[PDB]
Amino acid sequence: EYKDNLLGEANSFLEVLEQVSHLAPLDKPVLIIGERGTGKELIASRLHYLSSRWQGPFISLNCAALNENLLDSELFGHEAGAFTGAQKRHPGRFERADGGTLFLDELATAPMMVQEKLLRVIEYGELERVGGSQPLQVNVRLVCATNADLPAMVNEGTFRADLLDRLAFDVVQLPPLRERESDIMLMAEYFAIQMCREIKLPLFPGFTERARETLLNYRWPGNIRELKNVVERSVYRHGTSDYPLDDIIIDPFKRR
Amino acid sequence: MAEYKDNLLGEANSFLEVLEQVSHLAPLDKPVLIIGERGTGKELIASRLHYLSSRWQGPFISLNCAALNENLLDSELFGHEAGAFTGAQKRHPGRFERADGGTLFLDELATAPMMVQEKLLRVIEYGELERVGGSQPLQVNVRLVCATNADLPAMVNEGTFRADLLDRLAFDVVQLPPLRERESDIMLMAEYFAIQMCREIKLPLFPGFTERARETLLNYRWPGNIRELKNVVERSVYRHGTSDYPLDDIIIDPFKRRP
Amino acid sequence: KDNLLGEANSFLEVLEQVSHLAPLDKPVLIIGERGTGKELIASRLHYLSSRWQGPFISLNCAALNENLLDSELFGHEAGAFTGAQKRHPGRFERADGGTLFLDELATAPMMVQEKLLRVIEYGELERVGGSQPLQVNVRLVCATNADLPAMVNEGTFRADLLDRLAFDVVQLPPLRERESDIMLMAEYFAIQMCREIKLPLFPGFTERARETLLNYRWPGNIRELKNVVERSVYRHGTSDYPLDDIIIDPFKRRP
Amino acid sequence: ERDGLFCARIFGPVKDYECLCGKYKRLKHRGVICEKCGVEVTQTKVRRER
Amino acid sequence: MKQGLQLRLQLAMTPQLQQAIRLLQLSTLELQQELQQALESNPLLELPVYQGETTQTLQDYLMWQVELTPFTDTDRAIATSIVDAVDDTGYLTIQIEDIVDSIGDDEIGLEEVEAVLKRIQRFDPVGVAAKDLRDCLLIQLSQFAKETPWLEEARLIISDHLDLLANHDFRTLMRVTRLKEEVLKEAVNLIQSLDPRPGQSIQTSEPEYVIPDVLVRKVSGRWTVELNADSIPRLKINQQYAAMGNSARNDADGQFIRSNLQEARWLIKSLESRNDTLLRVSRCIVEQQQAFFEQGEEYMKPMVLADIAQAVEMHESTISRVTTQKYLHSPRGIFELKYFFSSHVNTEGGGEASSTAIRALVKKLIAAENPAKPLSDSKLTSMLSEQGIMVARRTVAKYRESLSIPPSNQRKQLV
DNA sequence: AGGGCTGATCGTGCAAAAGTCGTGCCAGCCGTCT
DNA sequence: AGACGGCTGGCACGACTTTTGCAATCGCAGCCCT
């Protein structure tokens, strides 16, 4: 249920959620136009716990950090002892896909070749990178999510027509950081309470309404747990939640 | 020698005649190269030829070029029989070797290795192939299958393809009626996809659609020829999700900001 | 030993030229705007030589892969990695006197040249750590569908690579040049295609088609003639009527 | 046991006139000894008489 | 980066430990046989009657009656030959024709052989020398008075209707023999108590034969497993020859004796270490047994050679040779080590493991289904669904054959 | 006093081929039955 | 009375196991002859 966590009082958070629910039995691709430090992962979770195969695998492997060109070939497979130095393909991602969907983070960097290889997957999905092994398909669904500008990619041609198309089946715009302002107050207090509890801080400092206003002033584009991150900052600013809350920390680089 | 027509749908343009010429080609096993919109009639055409391949013809050896990393792409290319390349063990037969008689399901991916290009040139050389350390040549056989999605002659003038990439390639060309062009089974394949879509939705009754939707459908470019529309169709099905409930609009460009 | 000869004074001239080259086994490379049966050329040469009984079996040079040129020059290694242990010998040695067309030469690589040249100029079978090199005087010849002297201007190859060919590089006429038996040549191409198309027989084409054959740019010289020939065939598939039109630019899209 | 304590071919035949290997298991063989085992097909009393 | 295999990383093997593993995989009975046949040359490698009562053994009991029975020399010879090839069950091992050949008398004929057998057919007991038992139960019933009812129905069935009861085909049996409904079963039951293998009855006595090699006594949970001390082989170093070597004027010959002795000491220590490694492996297995054996074979997880060799440093070949032909007596009793492992499965117990006594008790319940008919594989599948563990009808047929259960439409019997 | 020198050392686990099983599942069948 | 069926097993193919079957070099130095 994602603990129902990350409450978005923006009824658009709900509306997104409703779209999600409609999508929940639905089994086709989806983009989530996410935000910098927003938290598409958590919502994708909230979906997965609700997935039509909610009992299905839920893996988080993004190729954003695909420092290895071969980390790909792996993710596409390996023959048992392909190349060599190895026993078998470490197929965990390929495992989650069958009996699962596809979830990635910041699909921008992909080698275009890697991408269209993913293309030869989505329409059909052979046993891949398998060093000549016969094909095989993973009963794999999909979901997409990023903070990038899709038009910027389209200008970049970053997504091929086959790619941009067959890749995409739904679009989930994360509300802008400041978009869900009532939601901001909401999940903000949500964190406030969650922190005051788990910190075991004997008292909860609460919140200074001035601090609340200053926090609202934070465009805070990053808020994924960047909300939670600045939250921990502010907690330390208080240091201890015994006193009523006023010490709010946003920018921690500052000495003094 | 059977139908296997599958979801080859929406050919009310001369894509029907396109299929006809395809049929005229179908008996001959010589090199196949085509052209058209990616994810759009294209790999469906591939299925089409795979049917044109005798059912008993053999493995529709699919060739997906956007893969292959860099190197031992070479391995499965020329082959790998020796040690130190593919876990050694037996002579690992490449996907190229995997096809013996099979489909050279060449995909026009426009990846960098014209190195590869020359290799495949030798792949299309005398009916032969030779592995890594591959101590002997071996005269090979396979059906040959390419297609296209961009200006091959231009890239030739652009030099981008190996001249011989095309020179060995394409006994003839085979293009596609564009979505800006085909435009004929619009309502037809529209309804076909819609039928599939409701059926999967198990939607109790066909919503129906207003004519404003079809007017937009004529108005729409549909840059992705086959699927982009089809995705749009399923998307209408979803964004509605109602049975017998006549449509009056469709879902394609979610990048369109909400109102 | 036998192929679709160009039947032509330039063609028969290159024929006599290679014939002058016939039992000769000194190194060589090929000149030629394109290839015009580049393989077939070296191939018939292979069928001719004292390497007729020798191994008249080529090897595609610039095919090869990065780390293994050692073995490539000299077959599978006994001591390379643990796995193999048998000093399997040169693909050259797999001929070592036969006819093994050094093709793909143009696309070859830099240090790749650095070795292969020097060895060919001088080097018996010095394999990985071996005892004693054995010179496989293997019938030597390369090719150039491209312009080496141009490459020299570029300087990509060795001037030693320039030395490589011990023979002058014969060239064939451009299609624009050659264009000699293309009537009869196409006729044979068509007899072929009709056999392949299992077609009954060829009544013919337009004499307009004949002139278009004359009025033909013909880059894919040795290919495109028969190529668009049978292409016209299948796009026609019709033998009752002459190939008044032929399959011109498949790259061209009809209206 | 074999070439040892309580051995057939030694001190006499097996439980029945049947030989040790298994051949000649009947009353038919009076002194016949199998090739698989040589033990006279005989009475067991002579286990105390050899 | 650019992956593959690359050179990096020899001598002479000997079968020393290999022959040792040949011993270990070999059973300790013949393993000690070799151990003796080994230690023999290695010189440094170390009332009469009681009760004395004879018995009849049945066939001689038959001979005892034959002696009192009037018989001729040829009659005695035929009867004795008939007695010679006699089975424990009391059925005739050889046919009448083989007996006629064994008599080797042209005067001896099949009729005389049959007459001799019949005069001796029911002397003691009824149904002796059954001769493809069938007329044996017939003679047994004939011995019974005809005053017993349904004797006629049983007799007609036994005459030529053995097949109908063979498949438990009661409907076909009634349709063929025209036997009475719910009454022909009475003739069947009267036939059922007919002393089959009546000669097998005389044989009843046996002595004990199973060797406790290791002993886990469930000592206060997590059994204190221990091997058999006397069964564990051990040599004694020739300390006399150890002192007969150095002082030998051929200090070379005697010191070489010392060296061979040291090498054999290494061999014996290696064998003891093999025992001890098997023992620590047994410690792991006994940790397993404190639940498995304590929960019995029903609640037993299938283990693998990989699984156990992982807990040890022993090689998979090392263990795989080590336990071959090994059995230990436990609180349950003497149990074979080769029995320890089991194949795993796709059951929805959340895991992969083996059927075993689950399959056995499943056969038990399938039989426990209405004694009218055996429970089909669907019954097993439903029983497993109740068990919450996935089992399949092909899998059910497999596990049943493992329990060796009768077929569903072969074990149907009149209740 | 120098050479030869030669057989004197001393090991072992795992792989490669083989087998072999899980698992089920189609064909014939039997029950009987409507 | 004829198709129903549930079963059962052959069939086959992967999945796992699995045994057997290898064969000194680096030194040494002692010897032996010369």
Ligand SMILES: Nc1ncnc2c1ncn2[C@@H]1O[C@H](COP(=O)(O)OP(=O)(O)O)[C@@H](O)[C@H]1O
């Ligand atoms: N609705 C939410 N509930 C809880 N945590 C969230 C939520 N949205 C974002 N986050 C937090 O943001 C941190 C990074 O989140 P996010 O930015 O969603 O991941 P990604 O970087 O993949 O978008 C996560 O560890 C998560 O705790």
Ligand SMILES: Nc1ncnc2c1ncn2[C@@H]1O[C@H](COP(=O)(O)OP(=O)(O)O)[C@@H](O)[C@H]1O
């Ligand atoms: N008749 C149709 N109706 C709806 N969608 C279609 C139809 N034919 C093809 N498509 C869609 O077009 C997409 C791309 O197909 P295709 O162009 O063959 O891929 P490729 O790039 O491999 O050629 C597929 O995902 C498929 O869903």
Ligand SMILES: Nc1ncnc2c1ncn2[C@@H]1O[C@H](COP(=O)(O)OP(=O)(O)O)[C@@H](O)[C@H]1O
């Ligand atoms: N003299 C010839 N006789 C017959 N066929 C020829 C001749 N020259 C070329 N060909 C044809 O040309 C093809 C080889 O093409 P080639 O010129 O080697 O390509 P490239 O120019 O890319 O090397 C062969 O299939 C062969 O049939």
Ligand SMILES: [Mg+2]
């Ligand atoms: Mg992120």
Ligand SMILES: [Mg+2]
């Ligand atoms: Mg495609």
Ligand SMILES: [Mg+2]
């Ligand atoms: Mg070429």
